[PDB]
Amino acid sequence: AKMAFTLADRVTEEMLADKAALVVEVVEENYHDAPIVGIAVVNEHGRFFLRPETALADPQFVAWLGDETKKKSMFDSKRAAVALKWKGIELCGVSFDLLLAAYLLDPAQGVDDVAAAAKMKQYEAVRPDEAVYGKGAKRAVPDEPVLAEHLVRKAAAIWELERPFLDELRRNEQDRLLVELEQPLSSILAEMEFAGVKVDTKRLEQMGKELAEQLGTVEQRIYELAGQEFNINSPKQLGVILFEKLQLPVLKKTKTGYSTSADVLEKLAPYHEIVENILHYRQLGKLQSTYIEGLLKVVRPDTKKVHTIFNQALTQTGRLSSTEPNLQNIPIRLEEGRKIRQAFVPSESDWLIFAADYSQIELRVLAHIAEDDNLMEAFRRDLDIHTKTAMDIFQVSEDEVTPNMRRQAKAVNFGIVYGISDYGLAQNLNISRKEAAEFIERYFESFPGVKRYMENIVQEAKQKGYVTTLLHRRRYLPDITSRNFNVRSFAERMAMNTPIQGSAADIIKKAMIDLNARLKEERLQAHLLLQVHDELILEAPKEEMERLCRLVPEVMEQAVTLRVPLKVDYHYGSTWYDAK
DNA sequence: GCGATCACGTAC
DNA sequence: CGTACGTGATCGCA
Ligand SMILES: OC[C@H]1O[C@@](CO)(O[C@H]2O[C@H](CO)[C@@H](O)[C@H](O)[C@H]2O)[C@@H](O)[C@@H]1O
Ligand SMILES: OC[C@H]1O[C@@](CO)(O[C@H]2O[C@H](CO)[C@@H](O)[C@H](O)[C@H]2O)[C@@H](O)[C@@H]1O
Ligand SMILES: [Mg+2]
């Protein structure tokens, strides 16, 4: 049953046809400056395996790789493109990426290897990577015979599956989504990851020292107030101290013991001085372990840069995710944690950080899709949407909106986008279910178009079996027909939320593509560093700021044309923190 | 030693 | 109430 192929000792002409399935294997999960363990090529002339030392040193092979007219079909081309960038080799001509294709066809499948994608089309003549390389401590590259056949079988699957995947994408009217959006974005993300973000490690280290001091102080204060010492980090010793020794009330229970969520502690604060200290302790600890020590662990000691990896084929809504490190969840809400951003700086002298963010893109997308007259008019007037919502649901003039009213109207706006729920809104605003229901009821009275949309999108999900975004991304919702209330309700919220979060993802992704095209046309040195769902972070020479102030927001605002305007705010400074 | 499950907290 | 990722803890296991 073995698959035939040539284990070549040198590169030949027929290995360089203008159409081929290409495998450039990088086994390390984090592919930055990682080894390429083997190469496989399958084309009209046959199947070939090349040793990387040989192939990557061959002028003709390297030229073929960089020739845009020589088309390649691959799986996770970004992984290969980045691994090659670290070796000074350009990868061009990737016309089909099976990972991205499978992702667009059904993100729920969680396709993360060629075998998983192949199974979608009843093709099983290829092993899962885990089966070949093992996992964890036992992970390892097998001997050449085993490795070579696996890479050839993967290239063979890609070669065979391209047509069936493209045909289904076309039927789904997602072919342009793959070819004009996700694949071009893949190359942009590769450049971003490869460029990396410079880190002021000395500043982080100083913060770490100061935190260590405060942590020690607070820690001592906690033992003092508790009358003894214990591991504050343990959800058992703390449970005993709080709810047993100190007799604090048990307002919420996890599943295995006492719950100590920040929300639970906030309520217990009035009863004992130890509570506030525990909260403070955790927040400092969160900064220290995750944003100081954790960040320092992944900074490259030679360049002092962190090279995140944007997973482009993971989220069920079309958003990207970020890992090692996650640069999409850096503190900003609280000043103490916000200071962490002072550590992210430009990669060159006299360059600055430029950050642009969409203003309420999700609610603007909702206004567009629901065609709600009131919500559209609000954005056409560019009103403070939370104040406007408060005015409508509480029936008062702008001058009469109090801070608490705006705060609650804001929580309603979030609930509406997430997939409204009286129970969910109740928990969030610490109020009763009927009280939350009253708010929701008032909201729909003020925005009947939104109510219509929520009712209709749910019915549509049931009829078609899936919901779609502006650019045709889709999410299947089988649980929408479940006879279990909780399971069905979750699917209904997904039906309501996915077209919104997903369409916002579509828009910023297109904005990134348009932006890069503009930066190149203008020959600006400015380049993208990060994307955080509704914001783009760039770095550029100080001399380019004025041009960026006009170019970036315009490109982002014009990415798509909706029934309401899109608005983009921007700021720039010496550090990410200052780009406020 | 190791890997998986928790409970938690940070982002948009 | 939507979407993610990384942490320290606790705990069963080749
Ligand atoms: O290269 C990213 C790409 O690979 C997948 C598997 O096909 O994820 C791998 O790489 C990620 C980045 O290092 C890891 O977080 C993940 O654990 C590893 O399996 C895809 O999910 C992704 O699109
Ligand atoms: O009361 C109707 C109202 O309930 C929702 C859930 O919020 O859907 C329920 O009723 C529908 C029939 O009209 C079913 O298709 C659906 O499965 C059930 O949960 C709303 O969508 C609807 O407007
Ligand atoms: Mg914003």
Q: What is the 3-state secondary structure (H, E, C) of A288-354?
A: HHHHHHHHHHHCCCCCCEECCEEECCCCCCCCCEEECCCCCCCCCCCHHHHHHHHHEECCCCCEEEE
C-alpha A416 to ligand 2 mean position (Å): 16
Strand partners, A42: A21, A47
Residues 6+ apart with CB under 8 A from A159: A20, A21, A42, A43, A73
Protein residue nearest nucleotide C10, by CA to C1' = A234
Q: Is the CB of A255 under 7 A from strand B?
A: yes
Q: How far is the CA of A322 from the centre of ligand 3 (A)?
A: 18
Beta bridge pairs of residue A529: none
Region for residue A293 given its phi and psi (left: phi exceeds 0; alpha: psi -120 to 50; beta: otherwise):
alpha
Contact A444, A436 (CB under 8 A): no
Residues in chain A whose C lies over 2.5 Å from the next residue's N (breaks after)? none
* Domain A310-360+505-579 CATH assignment equals 3.30.10.20: no
- Tell me the backbone φ, ψ of residue A158, rounded to 5 degrees: -60, -45
Cite the residue boundaries of each domain of chain A with CATH code 1.10.150.20.
361-504
Residues 6+ apart with CB under 8 A from A279: A262, A265, A266, A269
In this structure, which residue's CA is closest to atom 22 in ligand 2? A455
Ligand 2: residue of A458, A477, A492 to mutate (most ligand atoms within 8 A of CB) is: A458
Bridge partners of residue A310, in order along the sequence = A322
Q: Ligand 1 site: residues with CB under 6 angstroms? A: A 29-30, 76, 79, 99, 112-113, 309, 311-314, 323
* C-alpha torsion angle, residues A277, A278, A279, A284 (rounded to 10): 90
Amino acid at A293: E
Determine the protein residue whose CA lies at the shortest distance from the C1' of C5: A326
Element (H, E) at A440: helix A433-446
In angstroms, the CA A440 to CA A453 distance is 15
DSSP secondary structure string, A109-157? G---SHHHHHHTTT--SS--HHHHH--GGG-----HHHHHHHHHHHHHH
Expressed in percent and rounded to 5, the helix, strand and coil fractions of chain A are 55, 15, 30
> Cis omega (within 30 of 0) on the bond before A325?
yes
Pairing of the two strands A568-573 and A38-43? unpaired
Ligand 2 mean position, distance from CA A471 (Å): 27
For the CA of A100, the nearest ligand: 1
Please state, in angstroms and rounded to a whole number, the distance separating the CA atoms of residues A8 and A46: 12
Q: Which residue is nearest to nucleotide B2 (CA to C1')?
A: A137
Torsion of CA A89, A95, A99, A100, to 10 degrees: 110
Q: Which of A186, A309, A319 to mutate to test the pocket of ligand 1 (most atoms within 8 A of CB)?
A: A309
Helices (H) and strands (E) in chain A, counts: 24, 17
How big is chain A by its Cα radius of gyration, in Å?
A: 27
State the ligand closest to the CA atom of A385: 3
Q: How far is the CA of A203 from the C1' of B2 (A)?
A: 35
**Superfamily, domain A361-504:** 5' to 3' exonuclease, C-terminal subdomain (1.10.150.20)
Residue A25 and residue A38 in contact, taking contact as beta carbons nearer than 8 Å:
yes
Backbone angles phi, psi at A18, to 5 degrees: -80, 15
Q: Which resolution in angstroms does this entry have?
A: 2.0
The residue among A396, A394, A406, A438 whose CA lies nearest residue A420 is: A438
Residue nearest to nucleotide B6 (CA to C1'): A256
Rounded distance, CA A364 to CA A497, Å?
13
A491 lines ligand 2 (CB under 6 A): no
Of A70, A82, A79, A125, the C-alpha closest to A98 is A79
- Strand B contact with A54 (CB < 7 A): no
What is the C-alpha to C-alpha distance for residues A321 and A303, in angstroms, rounded to an integer? 24
Residue A120 CB: number of other CB atoms within 10 A?
A: 17
**Does the CB atom of residue A567 touch ligand 2 within 6 A?**
no
Minimum-distance residue to B9 (CA–C1'): A286
A293 closest CA partner among A332, A325, A333, A335? A325
Cβ proximity of A274 and A226 under 8 Å: yes
Q: Which two tokens stand for residue A422?
A: 């009286």
* N-to-C CA span, chain A: 61
Is the shortest CB-to-strand distance from A289 to strand B under 7 Å? no
Return the residue matching tokens 């009843």.
A122
Helix (H, G, I), strand (E, B) or coil at A537: strand
b/e A248-263 (16+ beta carbons within 10 angstroms → b)? beeeeeeeeebbbeee
Atom of ligand 2 nearest to the CA of A458: 21
Q: Pocket of ligand 1, candidates A29, A78, A111: which has the most ligand atoms within 8 Å of its Cβ, to mutate?
A: A29
Q: Is the CB of A440 under 6 A from ligand 2?
A: no
Distance A136 CA to C12 C1' (A): 18
Nearest nucleotide to A316 by CA–C1' distance? Answer: C3
Tell me the sheet residues that pair with A323: A309
User: Residue ranges of the alpha helices (H) in A258-293?
Assistant: 262-268, 273-286
Alpha carbons A491 and A498: distance in angstroms, whole number: 10
Q: What are phi and psi of A24, to 5 degrees?
A: -125, 90
CA distances from A98 to A73, A164, A374, A480 (A): 7, 11, 43, 28
Query: Are β-strands A351-358 and A568-573 bridged in parallel, bridged antiparallel, or unpaired?
Result: antiparallel
For residue A374, how far is its CA from the centre of ligand 3 (angstroms)?
22
Q: Considering only CA atoms, which of A291, A276, A277 is closest in space to residue A338?
A: A291
Dig out the tokens for A262 from the structure: 């920040």
Listed as ranges, the nucleotides of chain B within 7 A of a protein C-beta are 1-4, 6-12
Rounded Cα gap, residues A407 and A420, in angstroms:
17
**A489 CB neighbours strand B below 7 A:** no
Give the sheet arrangement for strand A6-7, strand by strand. Answer: A6-7, A46-50, A38-43, A19-25, A71-74, A94-97
Where do you find CATH 3.30.420.10 in chain A? 1-194
Residue A492's contacts (CB-CB under 8 Å, 6 or more residues apart) are A419, A458, A461, A480
Q: Residue A284, CA: closest nucleotide via C1'?
A: B9
Residue ID of nearest Cα to ligand 1 atom 15: A323
- Note whether A222 and A274 are within 8 A (CB): yes
Fold (CATH) for A195-309: Taq DNA Polymerase; Chain T, domain 4 (1.20.1060)
Q: What is the largest CA-CA distance in chain A?
A: 80
Q: Which CATH number fits domain A1-194: 3.50.50.100, 3.30.420.10, 3.10.20.30, 3.90.1150.10?
A: 3.30.420.10
Measuring alpha carbon to C1', the residue closest to nucleotide C9 is: A234
Neighbours of A579 (CB within 10 A): 21
Residue whose tokens read 């290409």: A22
CA torsion through residues A544, A545, A546, A547, sign? positive
The two beta strands, A71-74 and A309-311, are unpaired
Nearest CA to ligand 2 atom 3: A455
CA angle, residues A112, A115, A119, in degrees to nearest 5? 105
**Selection from A357, A396, A309, A354 nearest residue A543 by Cα:** A354
| Residue A524 CB-density burial (10 A; 0-12 exposed, 13-18 middle, 19+ buried) | middle
Structure tokens at A140: 């390892």
Token digits of residue A228 = 């003894």
**Separation of alpha carbons A309 and A85, rounded Å:** 14
Nucleotides of C under 7 A from a protein CB: 1-10
CA atoms within 13 A on the CB side of A516: 18
